[PDB]
A paper describes a structure:
ATAs transfer an amino group of a chiral amine compound to a ketone compound using the cofactor pyridoxal 5’-phosphate (PLP) with a high turnover rate, stable catalytic activity, broad substrate specificity and excellent stereoselectivity, which is achieved by a proposed large-binding pocket (L pocket) and small-binding pocket (S pocket) in the substrate-binding site8910111213141516. Each protomer (subunit) of the dimeric enzymes shows a structural architecture typical of the fold-type IV class of PLP-dependent enzymes, which are made up of two domains. The substrate-binding site is surrounded by the cavity among the two domains, the cofactor PLP, and the loop consisting of the residues 129–145 of the other protomer. The substrate-binding site can be divided into two parts as described initially, the L pocket and the S pocket, which is consistent with the previously proposed mechanism for the substrate specificity of ATAs in which the smaller and larger atomic groups of substrates are recognized by the S and L pockets, respectively.
The loops 129–145 of the [name] mutant and ATA-117-Rd11 showed significantly different conformation from that of the wild-type, depending on the amino acid residue at the position 136. This suggests that the probable steric hindrance between the bulky side chain of Phe136 and Val152 was the main cause of the conformational difference. The [name]/Y/H/W mutants show more than 40-fold lower kcat/Km values towards pyruvate, indicating that these mutants could not recognize pyruvate properly. This is probably due to the introduction of a bulky side chain into the residue 136, which could have altered the conformation of the loop 129–145, and thus caused Arg138, the key residue for pyruvate recognition, to move out from the active site. The alteration of the loop 129–145 varied the properties of the substrate binding site drastically. These conclusions could well explain how the [name]/Y/H/W mutants favor bulky and hydrophobic substrates.
Author numbering:
A (entry chain B), B (entry chain A): 9 to 330
Amino acid sequence: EIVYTHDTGLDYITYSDYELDPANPLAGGAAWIEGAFVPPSEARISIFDQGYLHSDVTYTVFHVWNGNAFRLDDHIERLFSNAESMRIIPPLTQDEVKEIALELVAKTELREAFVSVSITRGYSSTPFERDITKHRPQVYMYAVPYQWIVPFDRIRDGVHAMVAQSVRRTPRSSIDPQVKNFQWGDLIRAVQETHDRGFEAPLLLDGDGLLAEGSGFNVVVIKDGVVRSPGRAALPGITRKTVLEIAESLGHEAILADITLAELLDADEVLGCTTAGGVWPFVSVDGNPISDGVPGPITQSIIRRYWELNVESSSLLTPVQY
Amino acid sequence: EIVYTHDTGLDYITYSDYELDPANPLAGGAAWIEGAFVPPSEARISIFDQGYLHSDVTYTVFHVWNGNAFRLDDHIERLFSNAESMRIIPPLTQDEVKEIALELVAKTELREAFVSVSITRGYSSTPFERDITKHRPQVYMYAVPYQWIVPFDRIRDGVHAMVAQSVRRTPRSSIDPQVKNFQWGDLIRAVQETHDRGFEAPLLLDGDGLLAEGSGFNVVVIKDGVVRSPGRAALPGITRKTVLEIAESLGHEAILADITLAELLDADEVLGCTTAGGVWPFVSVDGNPISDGVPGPITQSIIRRYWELNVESSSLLTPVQY
Ligand SMILES: *Cc1c(COP(=O)(O)O)cnc(C)c1O
Ligand SMILES: *Cc1c(COP(=O)(O)O)cnc(C)c1O
């Protein structure tokens, strides 16, 4: 009943050839909550958790591909940095979190996986707790089959983006978008605007009217061989990071920068990236084509290379011990 | 073990004189989740609920005092209005929600209770669902003992406030603060700034530098007998609404308006209000006293009247059927 492979129609993206074990009750998906490994149907958290009642929680998502977790080190580092930005003291060490998460994946038997690790301020206290020692933070994880924000044919042919105008990306003076978080009020409004206006993906602007990010993904713009991505109102993504390293390795200048609306529209190429789906082209904005409306050459070589980095031996990869 | 009453030291606030049934496992605390009435230790929601993973959820909190719910219809009306603002279609009617919530309180036996009702977009889908009919929203409730945002002595003596400078209330163009929500990034940052600077409660400003609201409460400013409260960056509180009704009853003009920092500091009186604690004075701001730094006559009149409205038979009350 669980779907854990596809035929992708892409040479450079291939799932692993294997069968889940029917006698394993965590096969195909599972969670780690409060010290126990559980099936998805049991993956529940206290309604009193502040991560629910005040979204007082940060998180990351890493993926596993062909049995190796991608940049797990970077992910857990960011997670802990983000927790610290919120004054949340993780109850586990980074190495303990890595060990538990890898074992969680191991128990699902999943070779291609989406793994969420969230850390909340816990359910033993309220925001009005004067005594910070009373807080009891929780780590909650789950691992499920790799999820694609964008379909395979759209990785190959491109997506039609829209610049949201009913909403702007929450400012850092209210909620820091460089700390990964569950407070998606603005991102969901943008998705809803996408539905209303008949487009496929929202790109948001910041309060200064400059390019920010999308709904769960960063945006990258290419112009005369120079590869740029918003530095400010944008999560420092690990896919983005990888994309800029790829660009540099291909001979292109690659930088975080402020990008105007005009520059977005005038781009030779535009692309999107996030852990849940990888990298894909954006071939139009607001119904206007980007160049000739087909995925650009530099975009295609970044995509192919990103998927090669998922499979080549390197320090980017941590193998799961099934 | 459960604390459900207090000696308050205030003549106008008195808890009911009763004992819980020790043989009733829901006594003193319970939740309603997915059709089941449960004790607090079994009150859990799916971690895949978009109300956690994307804070895609609105709520309200109503209280029960001496066995009567206070302004229950305004609350559920507001909750359904807020849900509509988010395009969440409640899976129950307003009347069904009232019936369940009152039954929940009955089973707890609490005569003085805090009751949360939240509605999420549910766990059967993600924000990347093209087909919006596949969303299955969830209503989650809990009822626990009445919760006081400020201690009794500070209702009497007044609270020392602080205008936050490290943070602004989230703009309406990102997350609408007139829709009650769990996305407290900014509110919590304002509270943390309160710890850092050594004050008791935060008041935020909006992006225009005008008075917004507090972390879980509305602010009201009184000057030459005129009672004003921020109209824009502030939740339309049912407590606020009651305060202005009371204010009109006493002969004062009472309005929603834009309030400056300078007006805040020059006020004759300032107070705070919310469901979880009632009404209370703010006797200083950033260390500067408001007037003579003791609670003012109008505020004291409001507070006393609010507590009479919690007790006198009127259309504002709905009895719990114990
Ligand atoms: C997950 C996410 C990204 C991408 O981060 P990766 O580390 O590449 O997964 C970008 N923006 C937002 C808002 C996100 O939630
Ligand atoms: C709950 C709340 C209030 C007060 O609303 P009531 O209807 O009086 O409870 C004010 N501001 C915020 C941000 C809130 O969450």
